[PDB]
Design a protein around this nucleic acid. Structure first.
Ligand SMILES: [Mg+2]
Ligand SMILES: [Mg+2]
Ligand SMILES: [Zn+2]
Ligand SMILES: [Zn+2]
Ligand SMILES: [Zn+2]
Ligand SMILES: [Zn+2]
Lengths: 162, 162
DNA sequence: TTGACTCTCTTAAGAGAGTCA
DNA sequence: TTGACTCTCTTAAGAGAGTCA
């Protein structure tokens, strides 16, 4: 098995490579009518992506390193968390984009949490709008707001009570 | 079926049948430390479910009627909305449980909205905790809260900024 | 050892359609 | 005509693994 030192070396090589990705400045809602700035380190749209990186899906990538003749591969956003527990409350941990920018690989924009916690950030009011996430959101979720509901609750007769 | 009269007759038959489902009282968090009460009309756990109803999945049902000598079938929660647009901004409209109780078929607990709007209600703070849904939530979402994040954003080196 | 592709899978909110009796 | 089953699919947040040179 890879040793702690070998895992640290994987994380360090990943950081070195991602740190050279184009850094894109994005202005983002924080909640409470305030605007902030996030700096995303974006993997390229097409090959080559960077040493060790390859695309396995439209917005999915993997990082690969060969150590002592054995090929090891990880989801491209999971690398910062290789020294962390991989499950919690019986749920698999997932890499969760605090910046909501799938191509971004900035580890300061990622956290490691259940898929439900991950998804829920899409609707968070944001760090200046009432976020209650213990690991705080960096921005208001892109789907926060009144929504676009086409039809609300309704009955034609009198068979029901709320 | 095709005619407005036929569609109204389908909605009316559905309401009459669902109106005879057992009414189960559920006390629910509203947000803001307040509690409310919902009356869910719950489809049975096993056959028979009611005239026109059959289970297509562990928590999935369909309603069917024979009109013009042909079988017409719908997802069991979609029937209240047969006269509504079936899409919004190019996204499919879905039946969305305001009570977060799949077996419930009370139309006073359903709305018709995109899957994203639907999902997002799982994390809403609720009608007394800051819900901003234009079609208001009936309760705080079951997944609202601080989450259980295992690891937050972090870097080993000095290549990244927020 | 490395790059650039290929494929299918998970989850939990939701769907459509076919086989028998 | 009605009932009770069977199967696979959609979405958008996420995954693992194979092939070839
Ligand atoms: Mg996410
Ligand atoms: Mg729902
Ligand atoms: Zn980012
Ligand atoms: Zn948050
Ligand atoms: Zn209900
Ligand atoms: Zn709400």
């Amino acid at each position: 098995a890879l040793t702690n030192a070998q895992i640290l070396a994987v994380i360090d090589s990943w950081e070195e490579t991602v740190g050279q990705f184009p850094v894109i400045t994005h202005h983002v809602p924080l909640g409470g009518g305030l605007q902030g700035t996030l700096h995303c380190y974006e993997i390229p749209l097409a090959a080559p992506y960077g040493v060790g990186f390859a695309k396995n899906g439209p917005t999915r990538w993997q990082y690969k390193r060969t150590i002592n003749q054995v090929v090891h591969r990880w989801g491209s956003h999971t690398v910062p968390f290789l020294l962390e527990p991989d499950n919690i409350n019986g749920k698999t941990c997932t890499a969760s984009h605090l910046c909501h920018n799938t191509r971004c690989h900035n580890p300061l924009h990622l956290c490691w949490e259940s898929l439900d916690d991950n998804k829920g950030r899409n609707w968070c009011p944001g760090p200046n709008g009432g976020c209650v996430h213990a690991v705080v959101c960096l921005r208001q979720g892109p789907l926060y707001g009144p929504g676009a509901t086409v039809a609300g609750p309704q009955q034609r007769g009198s068979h029901f009570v709320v």
